[PDB]
C-alpha cells in the first residue's frame, strides 16, 4: 500500500523540483490541500488546483524556481532547498507551544497541525497552541 500520504507528497514535490518540472500531480486529500495552502501563502510554490486524472482527484502543484544563474551549470536556485517529514507513522512527534522549533532562524517554516488547524510555527506561536509537527521547509 501507500503507508504515508503526506510524506509521499512532500517527496513528489522534492523529486519534481530537482528536475525543474512545471507542475506535479499528487492524489487529493482535504489534509494535503490544507498543507499546500500554507506552502503557497508562505511563498514556496505558485499554487495548486484540483485537476482530475483518469476521473480520479489529484492536485497539480505549480513550482517556483529562482532565476537562470550563470557560469557552468546555469540551472536556477531552488526556492525549496529543504523539505523533510518529521512526525511519521510509528514515530509520532508532538510539540507543545513552548517546544516549537525556530527553523533556520526563521528563514524557513515548520508546518504543524493543531486543534486550531494546520498552521506555520510563527502562526502557532501567535495563537499559543502546539500539536503534531509535520515538517520543516527551509
Amino acid at each position: 500500500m501507500l503507508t504515508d500520504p503526506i510524506a509521499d507528497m512532500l517527496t513528489r514535490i522534492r523529486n519534481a523540483t530537482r528536475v525543474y518540472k512545471e507542475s506535479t500531480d499528487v492524489p487529493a486529500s482535504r489534509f494535503k490541500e490544507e498543507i499546500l495552502r500554507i506552502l503557497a501563502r508562505e511563498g514556496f510554490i505558485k499554487g495548486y488546483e484540483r485537476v482530475d486524472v483518469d476521473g480520479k482527484p489529484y492536485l497539480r502543484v505549480y513550482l517556483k524556481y529562482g532565476p537562470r544563474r550563470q557560469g557552468p551549470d546555469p540551472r536556477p536556485e531552488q526556492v525549496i532547498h529543504h523539505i523533510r517529514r518529521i512526525s511519521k507513522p510509528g514515530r509520532r512527534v508532538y510539540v507543545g507551544v513552548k517546544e516549537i522549533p525556530r527553523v533556520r532562524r526563521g528563514l524557513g517554516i515548520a508546518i504543524l497541525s493543531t486543534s486550531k488547524g494546520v498552521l506555520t510555527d510563527r502562526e502557532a506561536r501567535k495563537l499559543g497552541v502546539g500539536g503534531e509537527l509535520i515538517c520543516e521547509v527551509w
Binding site: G90, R91, R92, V93
Partner: protein
C-alpha cells in the same frame, strides 16, 4: 481520587471475581513512539454478575484478598470477545516458545 480504570473481562472461572485487562498507551521515554501495554486486575464481583466478555470500569477499593484491590463500578458496553480472543490467542502462542513447537 480513587483511581478508575477501563478494561475487558477476560476470566470468569473464579467465585465472585473477574479478571480485567486494562490497556494503557503512552509515549516511550527515549524514542517517543506511542506504545500500548497492558496489565490484568482481579476485581470484586459480588454477584457473579459481570460475564466474560464485557467492558467495565474498575475502581480502587479497600483490599479484599491478596492481589485484589478493585471493585467493578459499572458496565460500559456488553459482550465483545474480539478482545478476549486477541488475549486468548496471545496466551496460546506460548504453546510454542518452549523446547519444542506449539500452536501459532
Amino acid at each position: 481520587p480513587k483511581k478508575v480504570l477501563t478494561g475487558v473481562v477476560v476470566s470468569d472461572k473464579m467465585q465472585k471475581t473477574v479478571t480485567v485487562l486494562v490497556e494503557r498507551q503512552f509515549p516511550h521515554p527515549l524514542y517517543g513512539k506511542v506504545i500500548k501495554r497492558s496489565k490484568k486486575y482481579l476485581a470484586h464481583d459480588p454477584e457473579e454478575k459481570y460475564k466474560l466478555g464485557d467492558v467495565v470500569e474498575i475502581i480502587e477499593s479497600r483490599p479484599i484478598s491478596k492481589r485484589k484491590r478493585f471493585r467493578v463500578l459499572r458496565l460500559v458496553e456488553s459482550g465483545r470477545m474480539d478482545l478476549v480472543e486477541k488475549y486468548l490467542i496471545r496466551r496460546q502462542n506460548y504453546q510454542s516458545l518452549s523446547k519444542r513447537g506449539g500452536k501459532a
